Amino acid sequence: QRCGEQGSNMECPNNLCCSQYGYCGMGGDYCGKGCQNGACWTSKRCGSQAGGATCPNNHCCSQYGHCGFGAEYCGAGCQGGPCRADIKCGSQSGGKLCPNNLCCSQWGFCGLGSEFCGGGCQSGACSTDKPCGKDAGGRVCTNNYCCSKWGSCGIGPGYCGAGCQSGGCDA
Amino acid sequence: QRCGEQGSNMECPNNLCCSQYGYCGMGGDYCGKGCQNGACWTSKRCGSQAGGATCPNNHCCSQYGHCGFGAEYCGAGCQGGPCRADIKCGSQSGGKLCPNNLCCSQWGFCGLGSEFCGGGCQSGACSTDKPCGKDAGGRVCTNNYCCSKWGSCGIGPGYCGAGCQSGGCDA
Ligand SMILES: CC(=O)N[C@H]1[C@H]([C@H](O)[C@H](O)CO)O[C@@](O[C@H]2[C@@H](O)[C@@H](CO)O[C@@H](O[C@H]3[C@H](O)[C@@H](O)[C@H](O)O[C@@H]3CO)[C@@H]2O)(C(=O)O)C[C@@H]1O
Numbered sequence: 635q636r637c638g639e640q641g642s643n644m645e646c647p648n649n650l651c652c653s654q655y656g657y658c659g660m661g662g663d664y665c666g667k668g669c670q671n672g673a674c675w676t677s678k679r680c681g682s683q684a685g686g687a688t689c690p691n692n693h694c695c696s697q698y699g700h701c702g703f704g705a706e707y708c709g710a711g712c713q714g715g716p717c718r719a720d721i722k723c724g725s726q727s728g729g730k731l732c733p734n735n736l737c738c739s740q741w742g743f744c745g746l747g748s749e750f751c752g753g754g755c756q757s758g759a760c761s762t763d764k765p766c767g768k769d770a771g772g773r774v775c776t777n778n779y780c781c782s783k784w785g786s787c788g789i790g791p792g793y794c795g796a797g798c799q800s801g802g803c804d805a
Numbered sequence: 806q807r808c809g810e811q812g813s814n815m816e817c818p819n820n821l822c823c824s825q826y827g828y829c830g831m832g833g834d835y836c837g838k839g840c841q842n843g844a845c846w847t848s849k850r851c852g853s854q855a856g857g858a859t860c861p862n863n864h865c866c867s868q869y870g871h872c873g874f875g876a877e878y879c880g881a882g883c884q885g886g887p888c889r890a891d892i893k894c895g896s897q898s899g900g901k902l903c904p905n906n907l908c909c910s911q912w913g914f915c916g917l918g919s920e921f922c923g924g925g926c927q928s929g930a931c932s933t934d935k936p937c938g939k940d941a942g943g944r945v946c947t948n949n950y951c952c953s954k955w956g957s958c959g960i961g962p963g964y965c966g967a968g969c970q971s972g973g974c975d976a
């Protein structure tokens with residue numbers, strides 16, 4: 635029920651802005667000053683300009699390092715987000731990871747969907763669910779995903795907790 | 806702290822999937838069966854194919870009406886989301902509204918940022934905060950935003966509740 639720092643970095647649907655208090659809506663109250671994510675009046679900073687900073691809600695990082703949508707943002711020089719130019723990764727880009735957990739197709743492009751996440755998927759939210767750890771010739775997950783006691787890659791208490799064999803293990 | 810139906814349609818950051826239980830993570834537990842939003846293994850349905858259905862997390866609606874990112878999705882025939890082709894609206898498109906509350910520039914394109922939301926913004930999350938209601942020659946908000954007792958357009962208890970003069974007023 636809450637967004638931002640109070641909702642553990644949860645985002646409002648349909649780009650509703652998250653007020654300074656951690657609640658979702660539209661208007662000056664939510665989108666003006668203190669806005670956390672969503673359609674904030676003062677676009678957030680991102681990319682190079684703001685330290686490698688990614689945009690929330692999948693917004694595009696424009697060449698000037700401001701968050702938004704449209705040609706000025708997803709167009710020429712976009713630094714991140716669903717850019718208009720195919721985003722490269724994988725073995726064919728010296729292991730680069732796609733941002734925001736997007737899957738890296740077999741061919742070295744960042745995206746989401748069966749074609750990217752499906753078989754051959756190199757990194758990101760692959761849906762191939764390949765086994766990691768001891769029971770897997772001790773192979774490690776990508777993106778620093780935790781390798782659960784079960785020999786599964788993921789993020790969550792169940793994966794990263796007790797008997798987490800590798801990855802961003804809390805335990 | 807919760808997502809989906811349990812988090813009032815709140816979305817996980819960095820396309821983390823929302824399990825059937827309303828919690829955020831990555832892996833089979835969250836992204837497999839019951840997945841609500843985010844990088845679900847089974848891309849959600851959208852657009853024409855799924856009743857005008859929009860994609861969560863700002864994903865692109867591919868021509869086949871499946872949710873995702875990359876050329877197959879934001880490319881040719883995209884039906885919604887941050888499509889690779891400029892999205893039209895406004896007076897210059899018989900009042901069309903941009904989807905997901907994006908601002909409709911002065912020129913009739915959908916986007917987010919100062920250039921779209923800034924002065925001339927026609928609909929969506931305009932940041933111009935123009936007055937609505939009684940104190941405003943009785944002008945109505947766009948997107949069915951509520952016109953708060955104060956003469957402000959927005960979405961939230963404060964706008965849509967008590968003394969909501971127009972819009973998607975709960976009161
Ligand atoms: C697509 C995109 O990234 N758009 C931005 C724009 C553009 O970056 C801008 O048009 C650059 O050509 O900037 C927006 O914010 C600007 C606004 O705050 C102005 C007001 O002076 O300043 C711009 O930065 C100034 C900065 O404030 C000064 O400290 C600095 O000395 O000069 C800077 C030069 O840009 C901000 O970028 C805008 O509304 O114009 C926001 C868009 O999202």
Ligand SMILES: CC(=O)N[C@H]1[C@H]([C@H](O)[C@H](O)CO)O[C@@](O[C@H]2[C@@H](O)[C@@H](CO)O[C@@H](O[C@H]3[C@H](O)[C@@H](O)[C@H](O)O[C@@H]3CO)[C@@H]2O)(C(=O)O)C[C@@H]1O
Binds near residue numbers: 848873
């Ligand atoms: C970019 C995009 O929208 N991609 C989809 C694809 C494409 O729509 C597909 O390649 C169409 O050319 O479809 C994906 O799902 C498909 C998969 O479930 C297969 C398995 O048979 O079925 C496709 O729909 C079948 C449907 O199941 C039958 O009921 C129907 O009689 O024929 C349909 C023909 O498409 C699904 O689209 C895929 O993985 O291929 C998902 C991508 O997101």
